[PDB]
Amino acid sequence: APRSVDWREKGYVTPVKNQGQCGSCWAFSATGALEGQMFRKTGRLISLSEQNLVDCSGPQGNEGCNGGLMDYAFQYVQDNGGLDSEESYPYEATEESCKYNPKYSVANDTGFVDIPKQEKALMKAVATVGPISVAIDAGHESFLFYKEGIYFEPDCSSEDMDHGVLVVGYGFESTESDNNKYWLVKNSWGEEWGMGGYVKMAKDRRNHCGIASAASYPTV
Numbered sequence: 360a361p362r363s364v365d366w367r368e369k370g371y372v373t374p375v376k377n378q379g380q381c382g383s384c385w386a387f388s389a390t391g392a393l394e395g396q397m398f399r400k401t402g403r404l405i406s407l408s409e410q411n412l413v414d415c416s417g418p419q420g421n422e423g424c425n426g427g428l429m430d431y432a433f434q435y436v437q438d439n440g441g442l443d444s445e446e447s448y449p450y451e452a453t454e455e456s457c458k459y460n461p462k463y464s465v466a467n468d469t470g471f472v473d474i475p476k477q478e479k480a481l482m483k484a485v486a487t488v489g490p491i492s493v494a495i496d497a498g499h500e501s502f503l504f505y506k507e508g509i510y511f512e513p514d515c516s517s518e519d520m521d522h523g524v525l526v527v528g529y530g531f532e533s534t535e536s537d538n539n540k541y542w543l544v545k546n547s548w549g550e551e552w553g554m555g556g557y558v559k560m561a562k563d564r565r566n567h568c569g570i571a572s573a574a575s576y577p578t579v
């Protein structure tokens with residue numbers, strides 16, 4: 360695998376979005392991964408509707424603004440046969456009745472791949488597939504007010520890796536000594552947060568300390 364990957368440079372990633380006050384991080388992570396795979400398949404980058412997921416993926420197990428899983432969202436898209444565009448089904452940060460319309464569907468998926476719980480497996484997937492849906496620990500004040508640099512998770516891999524985000528690549532900044540690698544992560548808290556909406560997560564830190572707990576991506 361190459362030592363640096365950035366799928367943004369290949370046109371895989373839509374501009375950073377803002378989920379507002381709605382527990383819909385899972386929907387933004389899912390739309391980001393599906394946007395990447397749809398682009399790889401078709402060469403067209405089309406922003407997809409998180410509101411569609413929030414309103415309609417209840418039968419697959421999600422609970423709208425009260426949380427959900429990216430895998431359940433991929434399953435909804437597969438069962439539903441489509442997903443509306445962001446433009447056709449805009450985001451409101453509150454759950455409404457399902458308004459899906461197949462006429463405005465712009466995306467599809469045929470299931471999903473769960474990546475094994477290993478840093479090397481995640482790195483291979485990122486290097487070869489595209490942006491990858493993952494869950495990270497976003498609870499600390501140091502993350503809420505993150506602006507620049509490599510972010511180091513305090514409490515290793517504790518049992519609330521609870522925030523769905525999108526890994527769009529990885530890299531390193533070799534300084535004095537240690538390479539100091541990082542995952543490039545797209546968040547859903549707007550352009551104003553972090554590095555234009557992105558965060559560099561510390562990478563290859565130590566075994567049992569990661570970001571590979573719930574990595575997956577849709578098949579198209």
Ligand SMILES: *[C@@](O)(C(=O)NC1CC1)[C@H](C[C@@H]1CCCNC1=O)NC(=O)[C@H](CC1CCCCC1)NC(=O)c1cc2ccccc2o1
Nearest residue numbers: 381382383384385420422425426427428494521522523573
């Ligand atoms: C996101 O981190 C998020 O939207 N955060 C912004 C509000 C600040 C949510 C937050 C979560 C949900 C809202 C209520 N309180 C919360 O802490 N996190 C999730 O949705 C989380 C993501 C998954 C991703 C894959 C690994 C496990 C975690 N999912 C849930 O919290 C969840 C999932 C689920 C499935 C069925 C029924 C309920 C349910 O909740």
